[PDB]
Design a protein around this ligand. Structure first.
Ligand code: MG
Ligand code: MG
Ligand code: MG
Ligand code: MG
Ligand code: MG
Ligand code: MG
Ligand code: MG
Ligand code: MG
Ligand code: MG
Ligand code: MG
Ligand code: MG
Lengths: 139, 175, 123, 201, 109
RNA sequence: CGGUUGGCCUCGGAUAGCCGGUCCCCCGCCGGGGUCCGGUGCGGAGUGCCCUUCGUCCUGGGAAACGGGGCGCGGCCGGAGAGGCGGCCGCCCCCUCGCCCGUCACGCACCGCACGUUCGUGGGGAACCUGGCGCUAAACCAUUCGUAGACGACCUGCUU
RNA sequence: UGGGCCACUUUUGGUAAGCAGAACUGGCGCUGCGGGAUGAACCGAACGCCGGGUUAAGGCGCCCGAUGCCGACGCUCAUCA
RNA sequence: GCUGGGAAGGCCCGGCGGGGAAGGUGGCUCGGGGGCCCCCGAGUGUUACAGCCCCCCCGGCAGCAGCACUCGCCGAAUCCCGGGGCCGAGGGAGCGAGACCCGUCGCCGCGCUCUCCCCCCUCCCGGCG
């Protein structure tokens, strides 16, 4: 219970706002509703941000509070987050969501045909699997 | 006087030069206002209460917004104010945590309206200054004075209650 | 090509979806994002709006109508139209067989179902 | 959408659910609301009971048979709240009130369907967790509803049958995963198409 | 073969509280619940299709019982879907709550 | 008389927590626990899933082959809260076609244009033809009764 | 026409009054319309018959047009809020 | 465009540095749990095996109310393009010809010719490689 905490160095994911879909490091805490916030490697300059707008990830950086952008930037780079994230499966889940949003009409047709054939094969294997698993004649 | 988010202005003014004193003195105020028109109005209000000077026999020689000197460093702010309730008037000292002086004064205005039902025409801000951590009195700021501060976000209430409006799964509040 | 009166000259490759060379209005087509590079495709010069304009026969020399003209309701596909169709399809279709699944895509039709909304669809 | 919208009343707040239901049923949209005994009301049980007893006190003293009818079932209490939010003295409001249908428990055209949820009326979303609330079933039973024990036993039966069906569905899902692991070598050509366009993380 | 129109609902007339203006109609299109999604539908043709007793002539077909009132979407009405449309004749009040087709005609995509 | 223009065949729920899967105990070889392993801004995802329709003809390739389709027959089981439903076996009768990638051509290609497209053999009401299986009643009045009654109503009797 | 009445502010008698009597301006009477649920007088605004656009006062859970904003910060639990 | 000829901020380990302190880093002392070795909690203090604030002897470079969405007021210091909706009232505007089938006219903004040279794609092309 409570595996993720708001703390200095905690990396959050900005979900809505002007910086939506971004990664952010918590620099400091301003009074119970906002955090001083800076993503130097994700192109978000330092500002105040609501906890209602951020969602906490599992990454924690290491720097003292209210440090400068060069310190938070080199702490991001040493064990860079842009490769831990993106090969986290939250990030590729987002990536799949956006390419599914960008999917065109001819792409939609090809997805329909592929998914139809795949479901045919899976369904036939399921039928074979259960008709083989019904081979039970034990006392 | 209504509100918004406030800006800090410095308004410098003087009485008009009569042929008795050819060089009247200048006076300067820091005034937290929605815009410079309200800033000049509040200047004439305050300076008319303090000195025997009116907008007719006077002028604004400068009215300019003070920008925040360090808008990326979280500061403590002490506000000395006076206001009047439905009964008589009271002096008061509040403390805030903010990035900007005008942000802390706006915070003070919304807080006084919340806690004492006091209106902005009732409030008079008489001092505002930047307090360090070891000089604060209020526990709501001293609890944030901690270098290794850490807390969760316990009960995340869903906000997009209408996208979707009808779903099949109940939301989750633990994250 | 787009014709000289603003109307678009389209063809389905008629052996795929039974759409000949026709005109169609720009306001009443939806433009998708899939391309066929049709440089170096010979378009006959006799493929104009006068070529595509409708034909009339009624009525020669007669003013009163009680007998009926049971002919000319059968719109005849002329031989020049058939050979123009043959030529332009013979020079378009091998390029369509090149890219995959496009002939099945052009055989299919477009439709809306219980999910997709047209303001969210990317074309 | 031309199908019926089936909502589960359990865990929802009365007036908020009633407002959502009323606007839907005016816009069209045949709505069924099942399990109206699970609807919550904010404020403590005693003051909700007192509000209902003041409503019970409201009576045409010349002819109580003509007077306001105090329905006791939780389904009819919810229905009367939606009636209060509708324009029911008109033909349009009467058509909407007919387009709505409410039930205590889940009767068996609807026990084998998927029930939806309105998060803008859910108690966990709209109330602070340190606040008292009441249950429409308990309130109805103490203002004179007769049938909360039979509804409870029938709901227990329904929950047992739903557990059996859910275990069947879980075995089917395990079989489908096993079948993917079996024939992945002949759907690898089709799987990568779906991964390319955002289906199948 | 296939639908080719988006389904909307006649929600009511343009109105204040105690005055209704029957020349404008309010439409709720399925799937759109903000203005910047209503932007797509902003000039589309829309139709109230209905049946009656007598037969009417059908363009390109034989006479049947279907009748159509044509109109088009004119602009957005307030922060959550909800366009307002303008029909050739004002819509009958028995059509409130019923289906209106939005036809993807004149196209800008 | 008109609406409508694919379907979702279902855990219980918790919200300061959830969901899924396995190795060792217990319940007349399934369900329950305890490990252990995953996932959790829900991907075993309702922002989800399933169906997907231009039709045929020659011709290959894999998918299939333990199959498809018979409002075709018969039988069995489950469902009572409003069951009006769902599921499985045996008999025979047609096809190895339908699903995916290809080869080949043809169909009114109706000459830019609207109500097209389903549900649908929709619901309701009269009438005609056509066969197979069946059935041959009550109510009210009038009359009696007086447990009833202003009148109606009500309670009764009438070839054995 | 020479019965007036109401409202801000001032004001006389009266414990007071939707009471009686004055001053000033505006109204109602003679005036519909948007809002105040409802209402001669309040708030907005005064009106030929219409289309488009935009507003005032007032609002925007549903009745009921409009917040179905991932609105901001607080305060408050009432067994007559 | 202006402003404190914006405020902050980025990079140049900013460099000679000079200080200062806690929402106190390392190092140490003490207290707890993991195979004498590791991390968390309490005191110590001034850079250390983190950092923060102020003054520079001077800053430099890039950018510049930012095409990293931190915080303004603007446009003689402001222009181009596109989309939706509603609407089409009016009906003899000819100074010239002596109007001739029928005013493509006024004002305003433009382009070419009555000068001569070029050059680039062309073309009934003429024969065509
Ligand atoms: Mg008189
Ligand atoms: Mg009086
Ligand atoms: Mg009078
Ligand atoms: Mg007058
Ligand atoms: Mg008036
Ligand atoms: Mg009114
Ligand atoms: Mg009132
Ligand atoms: Mg108007
Ligand atoms: Mg209202
Ligand atoms: Mg509304
Ligand atoms: Mg005209």
């Amino acid at each position: 219970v409570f595996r993720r905490f708001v703390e200095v160095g905690r990396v959050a994911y900005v979900s809505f706002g002007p910086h939506a879909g971004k990664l952010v490091a918590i620099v400091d805490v301003i009074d119970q509703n906002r955090a001083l916030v800076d993503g130097p490697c994700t192109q978000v300059r330092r500002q105040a941000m609501p906890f209602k707008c951020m969602q906490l990830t599992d990454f924690i950086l290491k720097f003292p509070h209210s440090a400068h952008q060069k310190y938070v930037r080199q702490a991001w780079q040493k064990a860079d987050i842009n490769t831990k994230w993106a090969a986290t499966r939250w990030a590729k889940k987002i990536e799949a969501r956006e390419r599914k949003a960008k999917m065109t009409d001819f792409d939609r047709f090809k997805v329909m045909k592929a998914k139809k054939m795949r479901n045919r094969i899976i369904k036939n294997e399921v039928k074979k699997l259960q008709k083989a698993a019904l081979l039970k004649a034990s006392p | 006087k209504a509100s918004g988010t406030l800006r800090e202005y410095k308004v410098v003014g003087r009485c008009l030069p009569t042929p008795k004193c050819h060089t009247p003195p200048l006076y300067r105020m820091r005034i937290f206002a929605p815009n410079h028109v309200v800033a000049k109005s509040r200047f004439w209000y305050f300076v008319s209460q303090l000195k025997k000077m009116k907008k007719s026999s006077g002028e604004i020689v400068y009215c300019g917004q003070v920008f925040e000197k360090s808008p990326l460093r979280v500061k403590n702010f002490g506000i000395w104010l006076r206001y009047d309730s439905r009964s008589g008037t009271h002096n008061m000292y509040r403390e805030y945590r903010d990035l900007t002086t005008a942000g802390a004064v706006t915070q003070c205005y919304r807080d006084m309206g919340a806690r004492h039902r006091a209106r902005a025409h009732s409030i008079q801000i008489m001092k505002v200054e930047e307090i360090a951590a070891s000089k604060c009195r209020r526990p709501a700021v001293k609890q944030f004075h901690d270098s290794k501060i850490k807390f969760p976000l316990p009960h995340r209430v869903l906000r997009r209650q209408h996208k979707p409006r009808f779903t099949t799964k109940r939301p989750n509040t633990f994250f | 090509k787009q014709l000289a009166s603003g109307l678009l000259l389209v063809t389905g490759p008629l052996v795929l979806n039974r759409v000949p060379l026709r005109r169609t209005h720009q306001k009443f087509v939806i433009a998708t994002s899939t391309k066929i590079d049709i440089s170096n495709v010979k378009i006959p010069k006799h493929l104009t709006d006068a070529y595509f304009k409708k034909k009339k026969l009624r009525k020669p020399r007669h003013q009163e109508g009680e007998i009926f003209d049971t002919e000319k309701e059968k719109y005849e596909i002329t031989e020049q139209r058939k050979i123009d169709q043959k030529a332009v399809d013979s020079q378009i279709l091998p390029k369509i067989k090149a890219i995959p699944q496009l002939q099945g895509y052009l055989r299919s039709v477009f439709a809306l179902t219980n999910g997709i909304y047209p303001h969210k669809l990317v074309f | 959408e031309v199908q019926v919208l089936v909502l589960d009343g359990r865990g929802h707040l009365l007036g908020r659910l009633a407002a959502i239901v009323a606007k839907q049923v005016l816009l069209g949209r045949k709505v069924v609301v099942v399990r109206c005994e699970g609807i919550n009301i904010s404020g403590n049980f005693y003051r909700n009971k007192l509000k209902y007893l003041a409503f019970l006190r409201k009576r045409m003293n010349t002819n109580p048979s003509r007077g306001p009818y105090h329905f006791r079932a939780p389904s009819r209490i919810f229905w009367r709240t939606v009636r209060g939010m509708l324009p029911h003295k008109t033909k349009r409001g009467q058509a909407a009130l007919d387009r709505l249908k409410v039930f205590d428990g889940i009767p068996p055209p609807y026990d084998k369907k998927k029930r939806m949820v309105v998060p803008a009326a859910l108690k966990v979303v709209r109330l602070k967790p340190t606040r008292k609330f009441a249950y429409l079933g308990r309130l109805a039973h103490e203002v004179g509803w007769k049938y909360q024990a039979v509804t409870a036993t029938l709901e227990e039966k329904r929950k047992e049958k739903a557990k059996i069906h859910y275990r069947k569905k879980k075995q089917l899902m395990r079989l489908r995963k096993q079948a993917e692991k079996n024939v992945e070598k002949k759907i690898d050509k089709y799987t990568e198409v779906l991964k390319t366009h955002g289906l199948l993380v | 073969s296939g639908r080719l129109w988006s389904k909307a609902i006649f929600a009511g007339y343009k109105r204040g509280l105690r005055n209704q203006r029957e020349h404008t109609a309010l439409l709720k299109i399925e799937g759109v619940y903000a203005r910047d999604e209503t932007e797509f539908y902003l000039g589309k043709r829309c139709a109230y299709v209905y049946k009656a007793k007598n037969n009417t002539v059908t363009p390109g077909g034989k006479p049947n019982k279907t009748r159509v009132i044509w109109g088009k979407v004119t602009r957005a009405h307030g922060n959550s879907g909800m366009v307002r449309a303008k029909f050739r004749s004002n819509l009958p009040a028995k059509a409130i709550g019923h289906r209106i087709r939005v036809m993807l005609y004149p196209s800008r995509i």
